[PDB]
UniProtKB/Swiss-Prot annotation:
Keywords: 4Fe-4S, Iron, Iron-sulfur, Metal-binding, Oxidoreductase, Repeat. This is Iron hydrogenase 1. It comes from Clostridium pasteurianum. Monomer. The lineage of its organism: Bacteria, Bacillati, Bacillota, Clostridia, Eubacteriales. It holds the Pfam family Fe_hydrogense_Fe-S_bd. Fe(2+) binds at residue 502. NCBIfam families: FeFe_hydrog_A, Hydr_FeFe_Clost.
Length: 580
């Protein structure tokens, strides 16, 4: 068929939208509510407006190309309409970018500047309390910034299929929010933060723990430990104009030291701990030929999904604490034992790519003798904001190392941040354990990648076992509802709530749709972790020298005794009750 766009003739066979065809051919068309191959069907934003001869103004984002179409994307009428839409949005938008947390990477401000739009009447509510919801331990809503674009709703539907984010009718006005406008924590919401990642403005954000960290740092008697998740070192550079896929581990260590933290550890050490415990548990279930299957329990989003939809599986989840919580528990017990610090004066902070980790850290029972395992969790974005507010020249910093007592990590722990990393590491350790060997073939590429559901057969002690990696909460729903769990006997199943793994976490740096279309952020971010694992000498969790010392001199045998007593956390279904 033949297409004419801005006077240029194309002869094509594709069956696609005007927007996608124009972007494939370097023709600029604006867009806002279109994301994840979906737009806001009920109140289209119409910023992708184009003129089609014989039809009039159409939305390029959901209008398929067809033979004989003559399109104009830059006429005075088209730009007039788009600017009118942006002005109408500003009419409901508190346009005060100074203190806004999306000041530096906001799609809406970009469009406003592009079209020189201005509100017909400035939106200036002087009682913001009715527009804000800070009840959640993980999420926060600021509806003075909400464009009602629907990208959060669509993203929740696609990534989790829970539809916990919904359009609501509050006092005859349309808002976005949780079921019955409740606190997200009190619903089936997973707190995964994918809605945040899909928001083009500062309407949805993470629950800030920055004041916690500041107060702890400024308290004279507090010894503030900091430890970052695997994915942080593969991601934060994006917010300092360093590009995608840049390993900035040493820069992060140096920046953390410059921010005043008293000890620089690493959550990958806790990942090696979790692998110790989980591989021991798996080898035991194997030698006992049950119980099966065993689910990972390190992803709090998947933990909430199980609690809210599949309580019958809670008993099959590993009792090992997640890397964050296991690290914190050890930080309040073993670390004082090798340092002399009063355990009550230790304040443990984690840097996570995740908003659900905030909920996990504040679980009432995630403490001991009155000491929280983890006292504060800040997202990648939060750490970036802290670094910039301190005017630390991150991109120019020299590399430093972490304190090794709880900062060393193997490649097994290094790849935790990618989908299938936990399973690969656990297999690396479990095969050696069960066969009492030091096997050299350790790479399990079969469980890697962005496939939603990845199954594999593995040979351990010359018996065959079936493992599955569930990559995304929606894929968990598909795996369960489909009956796939019953096609064969599964023995060890990894589950991540965020497709691609923690590298695509809800607390990660925002990426504009164009950059997303030109870069596979999931793959490029996981590339850093897999390279680290490639170039590490210790690639099995149980080879971590610092962790081996910790277990030999303090915790003892993993999976039992003091180790099980302190480093484990068993989820349990709620007892039968009536009514509900
Ligand atoms: N706790 C923990 Fe994990 C580890 O180590 C992070 O820190 Fe993850 C990441 N990156 C996050 O958020 S959680 C689930 N297991 C995979 S990786
Ligand atoms: S959301 Fe964007 S346009 Fe609105 S105040 Fe924040 S930076 Fe400015
Ligand atoms: S919260 Fe963000 S993504 Fe959701 S409707 Fe409002 S502006 Fe759009
Ligand atoms: S946190 Fe996750 S489950 Fe909850 S509304 Fe947002 S995307 Fe949906
Ligand atoms: S996959 Fe990682 S970032 Fe996403 S909810 Fe689970 S732990 Fe958090
Ligand atoms: S981008 Fe097409 S209607 Fe919003
Ligand atoms: Mg549509
Ligand atoms: Mg201090």
């Amino acid at each position: 068929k033949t297409i004419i766009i801005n006077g240029v003739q194309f002869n094509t066979d594709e069956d696609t939208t005007i927007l996608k065809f124009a972007r494939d051919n370097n023709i600029d068309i604006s867009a806002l509510c279109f994301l994840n191959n979906c737009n806001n069907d009920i109140n289209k934003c119409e910023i992708c407006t184009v003129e089609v001869e014989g039809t009039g103004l159409v939305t390029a984002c959901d209008t398929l190309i067809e033979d004989g179409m003559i399109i104009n994307t830059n006429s005075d009428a088209v730009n007039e309409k788009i600017k009118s839409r942006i002005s109408q949005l500003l009419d409901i938008h508190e346009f005060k970018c100074g203190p806004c947390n999306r000041r530096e990477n906001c799609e809406f401000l970009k469009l406003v500047i592009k079209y020189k739009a201005r509100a017909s009447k400035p939106f200036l509510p002087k009682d913001k309390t009715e527009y804000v919801d800070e009840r959640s331990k993980s999420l926060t809503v600021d509806r003075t910034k909400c464009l009602l674009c629907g990208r959060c709703v669509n993203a929740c539907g696609k990534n989790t299929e829970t539809y916990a984010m919904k359009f609501l009718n509050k006092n005859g006005k349309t808002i976005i929010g949780a079921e019955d406008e409740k606190c997200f924590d009190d619903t089936n919401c997973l707190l995964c933060g994918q809605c945040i990642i899909a928001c083009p403005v500062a309407a949805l954000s993470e629950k800030s723990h920055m004041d916690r960290v500041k107060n702890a740092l400024n308290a004279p008697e507090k010894h503030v430990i900091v430890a970052m998740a695997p994915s942080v070192r593969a991601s934060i550079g994006e917010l300092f104009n360093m590009g995608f896929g840049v390993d900035v581990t040493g820069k992060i260590y140096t920046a953390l030291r410059q921010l005043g933290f008293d000890k620089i550890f690493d959550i990958n050490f806790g990942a090696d701990m979790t692998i110790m415990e989980d591989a021991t548990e798996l080898v035991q279930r194997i030698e006992n030929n049950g119980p099966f299957p065993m689910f990972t329990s390190c992803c709090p989003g998947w933990v909430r999904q199980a609690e809210n939809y599949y309580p019958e599986l809670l008993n099959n989840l590993s009792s090992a604490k997640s890397p964050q919580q296991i690290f914190g528990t050890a930080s309040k017990t073993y670390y004082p034992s090798i340092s002399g610090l009063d355990p009550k004066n230790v304040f443990t902070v984690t840097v996570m790519p995740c908003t659900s980790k905030k909920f996990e850290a504040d679980r009432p029972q995630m403490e001991k003798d009155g000491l929280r395992d983890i006292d504060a969790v800040i997202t990648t974005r939060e750490l970036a904001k802290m670094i910039k507010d301190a005017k630390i020249p991150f991109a120019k910093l020299e590399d430093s190392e972490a304190d090794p007592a709880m900062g060393e990590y193997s490649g097994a722990g290094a790849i935790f941040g990618a989908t299938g990393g936990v399973m690969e590491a656990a297999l690396r350790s479990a095969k050696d354990f069960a066969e009492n060997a030091e096997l050299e073939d350790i790479e399990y590429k079969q469980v890697r990648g962005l496939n939603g559901i990845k199954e594999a057969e593995v040979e351990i002690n010359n018996n065959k076992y079936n493992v599955a990696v569930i990559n995304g909460a929606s894929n968990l729903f598909k795996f369960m509802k489909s009956g796939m769990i019953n096609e064969k006997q599964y023995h060890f199943i990894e589950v991540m709530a965020c497709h691609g793994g923690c590298v695509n976490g809800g607390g990660q740096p925002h990426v504009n749709p164009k950059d997303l279309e030109k870069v596979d952020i999931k793959k490029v971010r996981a590339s850093v972790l897999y390279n680290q694992d490639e170039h590490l000498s210790k690639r099995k969790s149980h080879e971590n020298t610092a962790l081996v010392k910790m277990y030999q001199n303090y915790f003892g045998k993993p999976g039992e005794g003091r180790a099980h007593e302190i480093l484990h956390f068993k989820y349990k279904k709620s007892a039968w009750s009536h009514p509900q």
